[PDB]
Amino acid sequence: PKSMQCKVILLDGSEYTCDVEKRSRGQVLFDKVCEHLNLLEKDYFGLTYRDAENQKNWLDPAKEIKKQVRSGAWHFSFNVKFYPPDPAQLSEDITRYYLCLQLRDDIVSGRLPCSFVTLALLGSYTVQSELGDYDPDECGSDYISEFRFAPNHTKELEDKVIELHKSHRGMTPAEAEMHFLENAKKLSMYGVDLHHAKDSEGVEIMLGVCASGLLIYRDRLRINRFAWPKVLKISYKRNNFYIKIRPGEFEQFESTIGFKLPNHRAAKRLWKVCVEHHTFFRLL
Ligand SMILES: CNCc1ccncc1
């Protein structure tokens, strides 16, 4: 029985290596990684791989791994797929811990923009969780943490993490991670998957996929949201993506809204993540 080596980058930056039968469906590998991580609340997570165009794709757990990675290496990342709107309602602290690790990478990477003060507050909870109570013996006036808190570090930010860290004495790791998440969940880009697109007029926009629906971003002043319940049908055709909207009260007809994606793979990818969000957050 022939086995393929899999490598998975975990959210702590370490690498998990295992073997699966070469005809294995994604669920097989996902189950191995989740067992490694001691993770029971698996529904919020998934594996990503990079396609021949170097685009991130979700590994479909129902489909053969070989038919998704195709010509590429069996190399994956473990990621949050569905960001819970209320992390306090997760059943296990360890689920919240992995969600914190994902959000820390969202922040450092710049995918999740964040004010100075919220960067310092999130950093202070991370430090409290991982090191425990503030110790002056470990930080002089010139302290620069090993912890990565932001896309760009300043001394002022390091100073502010330390000042807030002092305020958290007595806080336990689950308690600090819960505070981290109560702040992070409020950020306007929390759990938003962004896709470059053009509107039916050719104007460059971003489409955001999240718990609360499909968002449009255009020129800042020009924003729109389609809550998932309003969306009856998601479709793609060539380089185009469509949402069918329920008729409004007293309106005769449904409405279809159309967007142009970079290419056909990008339209199919946006379609699949929307359908998945629509189903997940309909049920959650
Ligand atoms: C040795 N590292 C290989 C790799 C694993 C996952 N993603 C990208 C590269």
Swiss-Prot record:
FERM domain ranges (all copies): 4-284
Compartments where found: Cytoplasm, Cytoskeleton; Cell junction; Cell membrane; Cytoplasm
Protein name (record): Band 4.1-like protein 3
Taxonomy, superkingdom: Eukaryota
Quaternary organization: Interacts (via FERM domain) with CADM1. Interacts (via FERM domain) with PRMT3; the interaction is direct and inhibits the protein-arginine N-methyltransferase activity of PRMT3. Interacts with PRMT5. Interacts with PRMT6.
Provenance organism: Homo sapiens
Known role: Tumor suppressor that inhibits cell proliferation and promotes apoptosis. Modulates the activity of protein arginine N-methyltransferases, including PRMT3 and PRMT5.
Stretch of the intact protein here: 107 to 390 of 1087
Tissue and organ expression note: Expressed at high levels in brain, with lower levels in kidney, intestine, and testis. Detected in lung.
